[PDB]
Amino acid sequence: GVGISTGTFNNQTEFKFLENGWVEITANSSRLVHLNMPESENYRRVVVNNMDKTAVNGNMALDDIHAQIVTPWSLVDANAWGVWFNPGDWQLIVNTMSELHLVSFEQEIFNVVLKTVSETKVYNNDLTASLMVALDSNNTMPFTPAAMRSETLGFYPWKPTIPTPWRYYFQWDRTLIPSHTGTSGTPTNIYHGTDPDDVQFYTIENSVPVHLLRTGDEFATGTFFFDCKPCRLTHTWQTNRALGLPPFLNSLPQSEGATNFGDIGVQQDKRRGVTQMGNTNYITEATIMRPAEVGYSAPYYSFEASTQGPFKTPIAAGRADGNPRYAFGRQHGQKTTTTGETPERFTYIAHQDTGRYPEGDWIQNINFNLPVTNDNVLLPTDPIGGKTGINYTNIFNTYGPLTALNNVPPVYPNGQIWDKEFDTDLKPRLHVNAPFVCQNNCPGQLFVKVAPNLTNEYDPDASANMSRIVTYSDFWWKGKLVFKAKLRASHTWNPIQQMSINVDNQFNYVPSNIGGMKIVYEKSQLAPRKLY
């Protein structure tokens, strides 16, 4: 009946140790989730069109034109690290573990409460009303990770949280020709509507069964199981210069200090080795044949425009370009006592040295007369197409068979845990948004809604919105995400980098006078790893 509890609340992280240095990290999590009824029971097709902003020349990158189907449902999304680990648990993981697997995931909605607002205000229990709950176990609906809009569940167990009102992308065609300031024409900036071939109008009611939980009942998902390749909590320092055997230092220093450098004792054009610039006798530090290329140069800040308008091309690793800029509100790390709509932001400068420094690059003629003349060398200071501010590195691309990369690091507390693989025939090698990629299916999105409490005056043949007795739900969500992780080993003599509390960062991890609480970014990959 009504008065019997339908479950329990758990936010314990349990570390169970196993054979051979493995640990099973059972990250229990639980939250009180609050849900108002939808603005309308209908599905809407809404077009956003900021021609007011993009019609100003030069503001082409501020295009927000898109079409979306607004759904009368809300999504309970736990796909962010902050939902699962408090910072001490994260410290234990990143300091102690080396590689990290994702094992299982399960959810439960329980202790549903429904309450109506009446008349001053009087709140009364709707013991007869129901909470509609759907689990897209078959991945029928379009996938939408809430982390990329900072819309996941909250990161504090003691604060209630809300689900995101769900929406998905309808198809549209849009063209936006680039223009700079002072072009003095009108660029073609128009919206073409929808290709009829590519129309899709999903609905929760047709796609998936819906359970009508009243108050004394509980919903439990199955125990999902992943098959992902490992994430690694260790970074690589070795660029191309670091791979392989250094040259023999024939003349070592005889006294201490920084000024006493060591010298290679043989002329550069009578050294012994192998090089790929075959016409050149010089075997330098920079020209000797390495096995492969670590990382790749990319055309940074370039936009392709498919039919759906311009978009920034992704970059695998940063030096700046590449390093993501997470921005988030008060559920998700900002000081909860802050006043204002301005979000807190950080750029995650990853530890991995896989990236590039474009100002050091250059191209030069095949003849390779080493005291290069200006005509024989193309430098980052040189213009392309007459534009002083654009140089060749902005358009350059060195991706090739010899390129070697690392998967993107975890980004606690805001970043994703998992993402689903593309449905394409040829599939991307790495996802820039999440470390683990579900290979063939991913956890079903859990959609939640409060059923219509109709008024006695309702008449479906009338055109106006149906009068609904105002009702809202509070319900408890429980989740259990299991990881399998390997404890590290101290291969090297020296101590490694480790996450630590210090005088500077102390008060980020304890509340203020008035319960002001925050969570700060903590770097996931700390220990160096021998790439070669």
Add this chain to the structure above:
Amino acid sequence: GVGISTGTFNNQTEFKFLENGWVEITANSSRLVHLNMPESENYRRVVVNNMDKTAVNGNMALDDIHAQIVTPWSLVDANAWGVWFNPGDWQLIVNTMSELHLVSFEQEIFNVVLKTVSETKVYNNDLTASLMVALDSNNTMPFTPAAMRSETLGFYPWKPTIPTPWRYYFQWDRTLIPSHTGTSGTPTNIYHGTDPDDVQFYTIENSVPVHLLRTGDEFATGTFFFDCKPCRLTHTWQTNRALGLPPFLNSLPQSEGATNFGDIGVQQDKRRGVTQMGNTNYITEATIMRPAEVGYSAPYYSFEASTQGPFKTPIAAGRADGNPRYAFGRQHGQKTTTTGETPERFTYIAHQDTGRYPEGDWIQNINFNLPVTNDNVLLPTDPIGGKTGINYTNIFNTYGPLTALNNVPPVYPNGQIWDKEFDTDLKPRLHVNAPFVCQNNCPGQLFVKVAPNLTNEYDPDASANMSRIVTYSDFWWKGKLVFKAKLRASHTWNPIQQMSINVDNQFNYVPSNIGGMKIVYEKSQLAPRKLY
């Protein structure tokens, strides 16, 4: 369902008589515990700083500076004697039983009722809301015995009671250089913040499971089992002067009265026996060797300072130095019909003679010429450091390998029953606050809270505190605390001191005209026992 009770109030105590002179005393205690919702859901960090009162010189001992983590949860603490035994039961224990063991302890919360307040006031039941209940079975939370503040459950079975709002100490660093009145200038009274090395921030949600009871189901703790050493309900009178064989008396008195003393026959330098004064022939009751020292002189009213500011050095046995002074409110013994904030107070003058009388002490020179001259004896009339008010016994310690001591007596009704042993590598001989001390684990602290009963207006991103439906709960708590105790035997001819109702103390044990009740303090070690 809703309408079915889930437990029986029981405040009896059985005395079950086992073979071989042991009684299993089962104490049951039941209380209606009333719980308002917390002032704020967020964990707060609050520093208290009475610089204003400690900056005036001489007020060093009034130092109240501390930091604490004010917590939404409230604690149900039953660790006091008055919760379990009434004066009649306590009489039957102390008057008849020589030693007392703890056996087991268990708790049950039952018959939860949740109610909501709406503005005149109308009180309505909320069958959907839930009491949040958590048990720290693992003792992972910081231990907080409520008896030291007199915030335990109430000691009357009929009155309802309230649980203590929970809080625990945080790190802080402080220096308070002392100063008498008339000091030239201000001492360094300053607060240094918190060491990052020492930060521990605990939360119930991340540490222990939590149960969302609602109105219809119970929470029950398994039978915890103690292993503590016996508390002995009998006191020792024998000072060093009363250990061993008294001297032989040659001239016994021949008539009655106090004037007719008996005399030892032979001169003090011609007596026989063992002294521990190698250069002295006088054998006297002060000088004759004894097996060991009962009790120890300790530096009385010595305040001692750590990183966290000054504190009193505790003392194991009092004579009024050392003897504990309890201040307590109307839940816990004061006459309930009295007005005013002012607590009732007693000082527990224990029977046992393990204490000291500092004004009688003295130290004299090794040479030990008998009628000791002024220069050769240091008396308690003599000033250390020129301070007339501070004689040597204030600065004096005689703890040693020969010190013998008793455990602290039980104090009824306010004294603690059990206490947790320290996680130090070297553990103290006794705790001055409770007779029994848990060797390896102690009963789990029971935390309670009422869930956030939100309103429709809630937005987690809003800076202001969440709007909550004003909720309170009453839940019946039932405890069962089992002891095992040994019946005494009459070894002496003479009868022993006993607790008794008399014309003076009569009306302390029955209610007043308007139903006021009190519980006076009762002495727990009445029968004398043989030390040697």
Add this chain to the structure above:
Amino acid sequence: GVGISTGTFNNQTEFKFLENGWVEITANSSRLVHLNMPESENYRRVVVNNMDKTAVNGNMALDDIHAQIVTPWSLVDANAWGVWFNPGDWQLIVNTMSELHLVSFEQEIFNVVLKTVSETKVYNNDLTASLMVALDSNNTMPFTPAAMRSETLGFYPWKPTIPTPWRYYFQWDRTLIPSHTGTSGTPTNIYHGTDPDDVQFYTIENSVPVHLLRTGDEFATGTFFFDCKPCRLTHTWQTNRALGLPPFLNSLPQSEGATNFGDIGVQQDKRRGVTQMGNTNYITEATIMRPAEVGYSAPYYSFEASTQGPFKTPIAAGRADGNPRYAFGRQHGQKTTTTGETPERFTYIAHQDTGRYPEGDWIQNINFNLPVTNDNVLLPTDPIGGKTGINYTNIFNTYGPLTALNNVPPVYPNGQIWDKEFDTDLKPRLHVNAPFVCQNNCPGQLFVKVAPNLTNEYDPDASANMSRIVTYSDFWWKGKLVFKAKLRASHTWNPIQQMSINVDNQFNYVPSNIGGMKIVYEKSQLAPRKLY
């Protein structure tokens, strides 16, 4: 056979993971040890008498007068942390473990080579000479921890080492009456000789069976197994002021910032609680009855005289006094390429707050009037004995039955691992120099010597010392030490302090331009632990 190798070098650390969160840590250590022949074969009794330095008044603590037996043997001592663990392994231990047991120890000598020098210098193999090796399995000889003098095996595997020449204390009687500068005359400073009742002359030749290893043979000390209680790698932040339930705060702060404190609502004389002060109604955080006493005050820089001369009385834990100060050489952590004789030094400021701050002490009269008048309070500024520098806290001792204490922390690399328990009938609670103390037996000391290669001219009747063929030995030593440690768990929300490499300490842990090395000290007890 001469040429067959007799062992294998091993300096690896294996971290082997057991059930239930235990890690078996197998530290292997291997060294080359160089042993010249003794200066003379005879046992020598030598007395050191530095009257030239201590006859100057005030040079009392510079007393070095002692007697010792200078023994031809040399001791191979591995009893120090740096012999076994490098900084990376120690980082893993301190950052990831919680308690650390000590399991077993074994030793080996292998690949012995003997050589002789003939006059330019010619080096010739001594195929027939032998190295005397003696294990004192029964501990007949006095235990002699070389780490006290910083003469253990060196901490670098790739650098040879030399063993300490063995010596032990003979008995001597001494009196040194102290004096200050400007004392009237030369005080008693005399060497009395030796008490015949206490004479003990030990020879390795008579007390242990001596093995003779030529070149093709080994000696393997079988596995000794310890039974020591665990060392804890966590530190206790709570002092007495932070034990128990904090006082309830009525005036919670309503705005951010350190300058907005909370306040207790109730006046100090109307405040509920318990105090060990029978005549004081003021309950305050200094006076409230804590369970026991964490730490203790001791007479700081007190020197005490035995039969054999003055010595520093030791202190269990420091704030300064009590904190150990190490002086160590090139083998044991100093920059190996430094010129000069001066040792490198550090003072190990342990993280535990069990120490005292003597400037905050005060003692006040039993009446306890609050604005204390000068006569009624003794401060650390007041003179005692008429001396202005010495104050009462130099004499004071707070040690009592209520004292709780922590064991000595590990000090990496120069501190001991184990030490032998004293043979006294009552044994100390702790040792100030090793974390583990062997309960009944401790691993045997290994004494090494190169046997005499006599010349043909030898005659025992000759007055002069014998003639020897100048010879020395190099032998490879290997040892294995096994620990059993428990991995930590993240109880707190907040991260803990952790050992890390950073820009300040980066070049401490890696070799220099001309191959220098150092080992900087590293703190053991990092993570906080709760007492109560």
